[PDB]
Amino acid sequence: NSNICEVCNKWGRLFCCDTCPRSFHEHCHIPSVEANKNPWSCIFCRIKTIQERCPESQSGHQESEVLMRQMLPEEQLKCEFLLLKVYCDSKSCFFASEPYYNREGSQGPQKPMWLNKVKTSLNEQMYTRVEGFVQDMRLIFHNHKEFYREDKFTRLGIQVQDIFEKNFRNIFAIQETS
Ligand SMILES: [Zn+2]
Ligand SMILES: [Zn+2]
Ligand SMILES: [Zn+2]
Numbered sequence: 001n002s003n004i005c006e007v008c009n010k011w012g013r014l015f016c017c018d019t020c021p022r023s024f025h026e027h028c029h030i031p032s033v034e035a036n037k038n039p040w041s042c043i044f045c046r047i048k049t050i051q052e053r054c055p056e057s058q059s060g061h062q063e064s065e066v067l068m069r070q071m072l073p074e075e076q077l078k079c080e081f082l083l084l085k086v087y088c089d090s091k092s093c094f095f096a097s098e099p100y101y102n103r104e105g106s107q108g109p110q111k112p113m114w115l116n117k118v119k120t121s122l123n124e125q126m127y128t129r130v131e132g133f134v135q136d137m138r139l140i141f142h143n144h145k146e147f148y149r150e151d152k153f154t155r156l157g158i159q160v161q162d163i164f165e166k167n168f169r170n171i172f173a174i175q176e177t178s
Contacts (some may be wrong), residue, residue, distance in 0.1 A: 020041075022042050030043065043077070043081050060174065060176060067134060068130070075159060082137075089160060092160060095140050095141075096116055
């Protein structure tokens, strides 16, 4: 097994996957690493199993059809993994906790949003469709763009949004386009 957390790249109290060499902090893994279960398989392994059981699940899909899916167990897992992929980027620190807005020339967003809030919402099964989760994710970055206007700090939102979008297209097998 790896000697650092796959998500945050730090050592510490790590839980090791039984079917792959990744390791995790307890609350770095999504969902939080399960109390018992020997062997234990991480989210990467669980996602790989879905594809292996249904190879056709990797044929291209339309985003509009993906968004309307109900949050059954496999879609719940996919949204968890996509959230985890964003936390894997160190620039996610900017978007993890509850923001505040006091900048000359700007007003805060009507509906603030952040990664830990989306994490709680997934854990509490508050999203009934994939669309719920994706809307909140994209709202994180949209609020950041709007607030920071022409400051160069706006680029952080663009960067972390690109990580989100790339991973969305991969995990949900969105049809490739030009
Ligand atoms: Zn970690
Ligand atoms: Zn694994
Ligand atoms: Zn199948």
